[PDB]
Amino acid sequence: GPSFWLGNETLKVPLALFALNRQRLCERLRKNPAVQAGSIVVLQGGEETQRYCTDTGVLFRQESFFHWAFGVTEPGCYGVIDVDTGKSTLFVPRLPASHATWMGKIHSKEHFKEKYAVDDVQYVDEIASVLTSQKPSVLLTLRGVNTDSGSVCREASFDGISKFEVNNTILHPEIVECQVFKTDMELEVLRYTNKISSEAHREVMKAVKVGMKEYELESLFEHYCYSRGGMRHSSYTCICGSGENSAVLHYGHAGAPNDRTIQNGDMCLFDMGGEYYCFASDITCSFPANGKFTADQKAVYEAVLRSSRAVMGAMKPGVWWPDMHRLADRIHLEELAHMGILSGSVDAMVQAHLGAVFMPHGLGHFLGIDVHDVGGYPEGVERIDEPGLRSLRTARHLQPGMVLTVEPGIYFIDHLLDEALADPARASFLNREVLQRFRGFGGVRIEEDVVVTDSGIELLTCVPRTVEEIEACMAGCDFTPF
Amino acid sequence: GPSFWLGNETLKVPLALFALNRQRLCERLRKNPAVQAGSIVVLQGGEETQRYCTDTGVLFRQESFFHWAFGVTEPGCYGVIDVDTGKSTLFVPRLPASHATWMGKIHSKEHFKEKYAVDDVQYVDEIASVLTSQKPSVLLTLRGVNTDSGSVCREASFDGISKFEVNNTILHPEIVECQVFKTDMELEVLRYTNKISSEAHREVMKAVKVGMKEYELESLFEHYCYSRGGMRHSSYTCICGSGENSAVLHYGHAGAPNDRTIQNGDMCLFDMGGEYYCFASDITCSFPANGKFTADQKAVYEAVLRSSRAVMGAMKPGVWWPDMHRLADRIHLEELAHMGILSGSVDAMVQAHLGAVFMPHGLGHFLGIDVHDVGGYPEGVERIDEPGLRSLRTARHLQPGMVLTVEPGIYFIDHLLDEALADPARASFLNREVLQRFRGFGGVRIEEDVVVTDSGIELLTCVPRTVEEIEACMAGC
Ligand SMILES: C[As](C)(=O)[O-]
Ligand SMILES: C[As](C)(=O)[O-]
Ligand SMILES: [Mn+2]
Ligand SMILES: [Mn+2]
Ligand SMILES: [Mn+2]
Ligand SMILES: [Mn+2]
Numbered sequence: 001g002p003s004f005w006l007g008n009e010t011l012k013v014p015l016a017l018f019a020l021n022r023q024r025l026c027e028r029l030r031k032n033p034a035v036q037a038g039s040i041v042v043l044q045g046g047e048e049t050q051r052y053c054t055d056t057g058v059l060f061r062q063e064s065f066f067h068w069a070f071g072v073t074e075p076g077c078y079g080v081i082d083v084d085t086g087k088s089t090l091f092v093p094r095l096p097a098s099h100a101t102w103m104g105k106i107h108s109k110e111h112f113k114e115k116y117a118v119d120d121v122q123y124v125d126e127i128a129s130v131l132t133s134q135k136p137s138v139l140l141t142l143r144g145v146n147t148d149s150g151s152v153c154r155e156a157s158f159d160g161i162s163k164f165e166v167n168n169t170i171l172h173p174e175i176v177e178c179q180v181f182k183t184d185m186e187l188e189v190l191r192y193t194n195k196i197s198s199e200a201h202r203e204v205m206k207a208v209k210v211g212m213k214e215y216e217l218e219s220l221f222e223h224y225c226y227s228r229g230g231m232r233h234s235s236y237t238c239i240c241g242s243g244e245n246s247a248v249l250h251y252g253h254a255g256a257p258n259d260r261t262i263q264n265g266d267m268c269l270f271d272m273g274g275e276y277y278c279f280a281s282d283i284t285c286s287f288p289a290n291g292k293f294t295a296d297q298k299a300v301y302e303a304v305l306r307s308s309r310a311v312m313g314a315m316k317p318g319v320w321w322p323d324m325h326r327l328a329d330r331i332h333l334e335e336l337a338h339m340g341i342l343s344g345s346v347d348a349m350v351q352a353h354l355g356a357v358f359m360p361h362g363l364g365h366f367l368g369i370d371v372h373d374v375g376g377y378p379e380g381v382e383r384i385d386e387p388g389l390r391s392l393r394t395a396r397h398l399q400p401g402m403v404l405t406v407e408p409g410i411y412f413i414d415h416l417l418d419e420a421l422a423d424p425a426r427a428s429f430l431n432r433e434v435l436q437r438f439r440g441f442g443g444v445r446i447e448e449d450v451v452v453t454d455s456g457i458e459l460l461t462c463v464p465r466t467v468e469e470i471e472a473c474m475a476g477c478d479f480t481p482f
Numbered sequence: 483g484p485s486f487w488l489g490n491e492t493l494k495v496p497l498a499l500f501a502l503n504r505q506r507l508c509e510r511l512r513k514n515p516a517v518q519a520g521s522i523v524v525l526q527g528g529e530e531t532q533r534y535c536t537d538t539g540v541l542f543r544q545e546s547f548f549h550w551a552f553g554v555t556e557p558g559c560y561g562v563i564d565v566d567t568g569k570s571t572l573f574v575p576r577l578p579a580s581h582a583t584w585m586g587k588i589h590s591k592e593h594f595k596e597k598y599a600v601d602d603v604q605y606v607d608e609i610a611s612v613l614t615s616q617k618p619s620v621l622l623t624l625r626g627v628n629t630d631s632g633s634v635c636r637e638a639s640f641d642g643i644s645k646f647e648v649n650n651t652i653l654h655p656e657i658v659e660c661q662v663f664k665t666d667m668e669l670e671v672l673r674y675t676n677k678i679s680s681e682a683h684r685e686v687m688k689a690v691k692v693g694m695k696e697y698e699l700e701s702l703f704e705h706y707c708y709s710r711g712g713m714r715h716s717s718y719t720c721i722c723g724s725g726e727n728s729a730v731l732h733y734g735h736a737g738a739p740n741d742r743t744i745q746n747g748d749m750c751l752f753d754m755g756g757e758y759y760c761f762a763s764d765i766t767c768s769f770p771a772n773g774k775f776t777a778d779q780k781a782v783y784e785a786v787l788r789s790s791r792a793v794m795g796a797m798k799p800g801v802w803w804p805d806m807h808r809l810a811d812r813i814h815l816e817e818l819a820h821m822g823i824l825s826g827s828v829d830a831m832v833q834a835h836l837g838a839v840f841m842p843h844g845l846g847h848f849l850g851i852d853v854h855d856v857g858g859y860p861e862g863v864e865r866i867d868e869p870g871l872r873s874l875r876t877a878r879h880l881q882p883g884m885v886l887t888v889e890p891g892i893y894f895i896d897h898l899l900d901e902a903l904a905d906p907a908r909a910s911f912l913n914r915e916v917l918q919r920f921r922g923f924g925g926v927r928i929e930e931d932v933v934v935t936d937s938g939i940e941l942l943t944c945v946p947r948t949v950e951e952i953e954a955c956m957a958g959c
Contacts, residue, residue: 006695006697006741007695007741007743008695046534048736050631050633051543051545051546051852052528052545052546052633052635053628053631053633053634053635053636054546054628054630054631054633054852054854055628055630055631055633055852055854056717056718056852056853056854057718057719057735059719059735059736060735060736060737061533061736063533063534064533064534064536073736073737073739074736074737075736075737097897098897100895100896100897101731101842101895101897101898102730102731102732102842103730103731103732103737103738104726104727104729104730104733104738104895105896146535146536146537148536148537149532149535149536149537151532151534151535151536151537152535153534153535154535213488213489213490215488215708215709215712215714216709218708219704219705219708219709220705220709222701222704222705223701223702223704223705226697226700226701227697227698227701227702230695230697232697232739235538236538236539237539237541245586248583248584248585248586249583249584249585250539250584250585251585251586253530253539253541253542253585254530254541254542254543254555254556254557255542255555255556255557255585255586256585256586256587257555257714259488259489261489360583370533370536370538371538372536372537372538413582413583414582415579415582415583416583
């Protein structure tokens with residue numbers, strides 16, 4: 001069948017990927033006791049937008065649930081699926097013929113049917129008539145809460161939907177649960193997004209020079225990803241933190257826009273991932289700006305490398321993800337003590353939640369069409385009310401087919417360190433005479449993307465990771481993964 | 483005073499630019515007899531957004547009116563101006579301690595006062611209290627219709643605004659009219675955006691090779707603009723049309739995403755412009771993919787070069803922009819007749835609106851903070867209901883300080899050509915046997931950015947334009 005492709009060496013993605021997702025969704029719904037015969041899933045695609053009240057178009061990127069189900073790149077569509085038969089119908093906007101003045105040939109319905117390999121294509125304004133003719137029992141629409149953003153996903157609506165029976169509770173948890181488990185076709189795309197983004201990270205490590213602005217590397221990364229990878233979007237705004245900015249976790253946004261000059265002796269923490277056909281990648285490389293780790297930089301870096309590799313080596317089906325977070329915490333504390341920053345009993349440090357002072361974020365998160373992918377906290381899965389752990393984006397147990405980031409880090413964040421030093425339950429573990437040397441260090445994060453498999457994991461990311469590999473890459477060189 | 487700067491060779495933009503805009507706005511409002519003493523302009527800045535219901539942040543770019551007045555890059559702000567005194571107050575979000583962990587330094591109010599050179603800084607949650615203590619007669623908020631998008635600009639709101647007298651009609655036409663006329667400080671930024679984007683267009687022309695995808699040049703353009711110019715944003719989605727796609731005016735968007743392979747013999751029409759600190763550029767270069775114009779390509783291209791330079795040579799204060807559009811139409815028709823595509827009386831071709839078959843869009847538009855800048859159709863200025871002219875984004879007369887694109891083009895658009903051939907009043911001019919050779923040619927657009935001066939214009943753009951210059955540029959090592 002047909003494939004999405006941006007030519008050159010970019011990945012051909014079969015539209016069969018999306019057909020398989022529709023089939024899987026129907027198979028799940030058919031087993032659901034709340035679902036009756038004759039139901040139709042109704043999804044609404046994203047619409048074209050402009051900046052504020054201007055006529056400046058914003059580049060359209062499809063809504064993620066719609067993309068998962070249909071793979072459609074055009075704005076203004078709807079899509080329905082007959083649950084009992086699996087039959088799919090795509091609804092596309094009716095453009096008047098005069099639009100050919102500005103748009104060139106206006107594609108036929110048949111063009112879109114062939115392009116997307118759906119069973120039928122209709123115009124959007126006909127959706128009430130078309131659904132009416134099917135005499136559905138119920139329309140299943142999408143409404144639920146994203147557990148990272150807190151936002152409510154808005155259900156499809158069209159003129160005349162009030163004439164139907166509509167259910168907006170059944171679908172969301174079910175399509176989310178399908179999305180949590182990636183098909184082999186989806187894994188091919190995620191292998192690709194990791195390949196390109198890994199190459200781009202290596203080009204950035206080769207190119208970085210003392211005296212450059214952080215954004216010069218943002219630009220270079222995105223240029224590699226688009227020109228060589230066909231990745232028109234990034235999966236999230238690039239975080240290019242140098243020096244003390246490497247301790248700011250979501251650095252790079254409009255308020256702190258990658259605008260610092262990189263200085264000799266700085267650490268860099270570059271968290272960047274290109275997006276291909278609305279599939280994510282999410283990779284963090286940490287390295288010395290000048291290509292040579294100092295002793296202190298090597299020690300912090302290798303502490304995070306140790307936790308990264310320990311977690312990757314322990315991950316397998318049945319593992320409780322919060323236990324991996326606690327494992328990383330224990331390793332960071334052990335290694336910070338081995339560096340002389342901390343002293344005393346590590347068991348006691350853990351009891352005092354000291355790990356969260358140095359890693360205030362979750363160990364990692366589901367990844368897929370969204371960088372923070374859906375499904376981390378389905379009904380019944382609770383957030384753990386402790387520092388660090390409460391920021392985990394899932395408390396699930398691992399199962400084959402899940403895609404996770406593994407992103408431990410250690411950071412020197414002044415207000416968290418000062419809180420600890422003010423707290424008698426924590427202050428005694430800290431050695432100010434050594435810690436003072438790490439004030440303003442920034443931080444290190446080592447972030448890999450992995451697939452849970454029957455036997456463990458599959459590592460998707462392919463970047464230099466040991467001190468020796470990184471120094472070689474920065475000197476321009478050719479490295480072995482976990 | 484302070485300046486915005488992204489280091490390296492990027493432009494230092496004095497924050498005095500925005501202070502001058504505030505002053506100019508107050509000066510215009512003070513002259514409006516409907517404006518009450520004690521009025522306060524209240525603007526609301528843009529807020530951070532995410533993709534749909536995801537927690538995927540969208541990179542924040544400031545709302546254009548707010549930017550014009552304040553130059554503020556942070557989301558979640560408000561800004562007010564006392565009309566009678568000119569005094570400015572910026573309202574910034576009061577951030578929680580955790581912002582220090584995830585987003586960065588929690589800057590003090592004094593930091594922002596110094597950064598933006600405003601008279602006072604307060605927190606957003608204090609705006610009702612602060613405005614109350616000033617005892618304004620009326621709050622002037624911003625509501626009006628953009629004449630390109632048709633969208634209604636949404637006025638500021640805050641908790642407690644219902645307790646004030648609010649007017650939402652006076653401000654919009656007044657701030658728009660100020661934006662129409664660029665200050666010398668604004669012109670320095672538009673010279674810079676044109677400089678970087680012109681350099682980037684030159685690099686793209688040197689880099690194009692048969693066999694590349696269109697989007698490889700989009701990528702290169704934006705990388706040049708960001709890494710060398712500090713332009714994190716483009717002014718609009720890059721249009722990288724090759725072959726017949728150069729006839730598709732609305733090309734490059736998500737439905738037609740610069741994904742065609744450039745072939746030997748194609749024309750390229752690349753319309754790209756970086757944005758610096760929310761100031762636009764808007765440039766189109768047209769050229770043969772393989773670096774050498776064929777005879778037909780030279781003829782079409784030189785026709786558009788002729789109208790481009792005739793229009794620029796005629797532009798000066800008092801000139802009616804629709805007359806310039808008609809000038810370009812007439813020249814295109816003349817050249818298309820010289821080429822043998824047309825025959826007969828050009829006067830009669832003009833009477834039959836034949837020019838619009840080949841150039842269906844407007845000759846050019848105001849440019850500033852937005853690529854299609856505000857103020858093209860203020861009250862009393864009407865849209866002309868004729869082909870071509872109805873797509874003009876302004877029907878105003880030119881005055882010093884206006885910034886315009888000059889962007890004539892000729893395209894071979896099947897829908898329009900077929901229509902013209904069906905109409906006996908137009909078909910008699912069209913030589914079907916010659917036109918057939920140009921089906922699938924695509925099109926040519928030559929787009930310059932210019933400033934109206936007291937005596938004529940200043941050209942901002944600097945790219946190769948003659949056939950000889952373009953071929954030389956593309957052959958450069
Ligand atoms: C800062 As992230 C995209 O690894 O959650
Ligand atoms: C296609 As345009 C931004 O020049 O109007
Ligand atoms: Mn990341
Ligand atoms: Mn991540
Ligand atoms: Mn343009
Ligand atoms: Mn333009």
